[PDB]
């Protein structure tokens, strides 16, 4: 049938409506089947079950500015919360494009996991992906390149080997053992479980946690 095991694909999180880089692990039946996929860089989530609807062949082809026509549904990067920043990958129908001397302006209606979002100013016009349509093209069986996702930091430049205090631990600057990296519900700064002067031994089951700076 359609998608095979080991095949690299994109899994759409029905909640936020975004597409994530994943890989098929198993395929069961209830084209009405269940896809058990694992996310490349989300091991803490393990295997996840997906409807055939929320699974497509891994994106690979980039549509450059010149070939972007209005009314063309594609997959681009957008950050609904911080539009001026890099976000995640959603489906969108390009509404209009406007090129001047200072910038190529791309506008599209970003589709989310509940309802559309009309007339969004797409920042990354060079990173537009063509949606692989079921059947057309070959299956992705070889480990492909990585799309850049998640907001970037202008203090360490997202360089893994660099210690930061804005995107990493507000205290030391490390970036390891991230599931123990408490995040204050006030200044959004990260604090390791084992860094602040009474080192906590576990995760505060309490919904909120306000760091020392914020009491």
């Amino acid at each position: 049938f359609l998608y095979k095991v080991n095949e690299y694909v994109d899994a759409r999180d029905t909640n936020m409506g975004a597409w994530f880089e994943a890989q098929v692990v198993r395929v069961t039946r209830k084209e009405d089947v269940i896809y058990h996929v694992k996310y490349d860089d989300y091991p803490e989530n393990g295997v996840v079950q997906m409807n055939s609807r929320d699974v497509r062949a891994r994106a690979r082809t980039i549509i450059k500015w010149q070939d972007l026509e209005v009314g063309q549904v594609v997959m681009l990067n957008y950050n609904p919360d911080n539009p001026k920043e890099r976000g995640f990958w959603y489906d969108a129908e390009i509404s209009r494009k406007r090129e001047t001397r200072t910038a190529r302006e791309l506008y599209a209606n970003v589709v989310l996991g509940d309802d559309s979002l009309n007339d969004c100013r797409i920042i990354f016009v060079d990173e537009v992906f063509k949606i692989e349509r079921p059947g057309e093209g070959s299956p992705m069986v070889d480990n492909p390149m990585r799309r850049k996702s998640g907001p970037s930091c202008k203090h360490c430049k997202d360089d893994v080997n660099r210690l930061c205090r804005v995107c990493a631990c507000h205290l030391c600057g490390g970036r390891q053992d991230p599931d123990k990296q408490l995040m204050c519900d006030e200044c959004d700064m990260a604090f390791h479980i084992y860094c602040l002067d009474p080192p906590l031994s576990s995760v505060p089951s309490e919904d909120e946690w306000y760091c020392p700076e914020c009491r």
Binding site: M16, E44, D179, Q181, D185, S205, W209
Partner: peptide, 10 residues
């Protein structure tokens, strides 16, 4: 409680 691993998917 929000850990950096949890708040990833905004």
């Amino acid at each position: 409680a929000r850990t950096k691993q949890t708040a990833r998917k905004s």
